[PDB]
């Protein structure tokens, strides 16, 4: 029953090939609802969920204005960060920013976040009090001093505790059929010999939402963490997710092994067995 709204922004420099590529996406939980791509023809923030389509012209105009302003800031940032780190024009570099807010089952604010990364590593992040900064290295200390002097945290806190939470509530209401649903996983295990003496056991979960799920293997009740191959949870493309976990076991020992599935859609966690 808990929920989140998050916006993700990626800007990538391209040496001697024009302006940086900029992409923004926004999500409620594991459902995308808006996008912007600097390389696309429209130059507009665009809907990517049926329930956001009803927002009027002022919404789309305002969101487009904001996202273009983010794009321009990250364009400057790529230059600034090359200065901070004494880097040349020879290579491409990446800035990422993500921010948003979490609410619990009662839709009341839990926490807010705002994090920035340069070349795949933490650069600077707002702390949990929304009043102070964690800077990951010396160059990010420079940003921290500048952002402290400019009172950026107070502005972000007002957004995260106010606007973010208010609009997440509106979206949860307008997209209730999609967003406030829970699809329990449809589960099964498969068995395939990999030789005359071993078998792969694979535990499947299909057709679930939200994406959060735990799949684990036990052998006589003991967790087989180091021997389990667990794949990344993946989109089926219809709004649901899939995940599997596998172990390779000696043939004849299948009955010692159980797969265990936890999801918020299940009335109880499931244990699947070979007997």
């Amino acid at each position: 029953g808990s929920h989140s709204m998050r916006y993700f922004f990626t800007s990538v420099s391209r040496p001697g090939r024009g302006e940086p590529r900029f992409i923004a996406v926004g999500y409620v939980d594991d459902t995308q609802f808006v996008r912007f791509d600097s390389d696309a023809a429209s130059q507009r923030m665009e809907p990517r969920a049926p329930w956001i389509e009803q927002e009027g012209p002022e919404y789309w105009d305002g969101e487009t204005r904001k996202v273009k302003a983010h794009s321009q800031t990250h364009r400057v940032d790529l230059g600034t960060l090359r200065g901070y780190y004494n880097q040349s024009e020879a290579g491409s570099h990446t800035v990422q920013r993500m921010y948003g807010c979490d609410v619990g089952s009662d839709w009341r604010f839990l926490r807010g976040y705002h994090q920035y990364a340069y070349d795949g590593k933490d650069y600077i992040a707002l702390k949990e009090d929304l009043r102070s900064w964690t800077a990951a290295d010396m160059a990010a200390q420079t940003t921290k001093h500048k952002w402290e002097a400019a009172h950026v945290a107070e502005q972000l806190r007002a957004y995260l505790e106010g606007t973010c939470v208010e609009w997440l509530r509106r979206y949860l209401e307008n997209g209730k059929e999609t967003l406030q649903r829970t699809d329990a996983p449809k589960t099964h295990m498969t068995h395939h010999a990999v030789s005359d003496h071993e078998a792969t056991l694979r535990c499947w979960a299909l057709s679930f939402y939200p994406a959060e799920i735990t799949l684990t293997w036990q052998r006589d009740g003991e967790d087989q963490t180091q021997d389990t191959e667990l794949v990344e949870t993946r989109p089926a493309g219809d709004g649901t997710f899939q995940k599997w976990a596998a172990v390779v076991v000696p043939s004849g020992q299948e009955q010692r092994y159980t797969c265990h599935v936890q999801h918020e859609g299940l009335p109880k966690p499931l244990t699947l067995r070979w007997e």
Binding site: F8, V25, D37, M98, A117, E232
Partner: peptide, 17 residues
């Protein structure tokens, strides 16, 4: 393909279909 997004650890993901 889906629009470029990323995880909590900054790594990217895409779905082609």
């Amino acid at each position: 393909h889906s629009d470029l997004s990323f995880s909590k650890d900054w790594s990217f993901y895409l779905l082609y279909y």
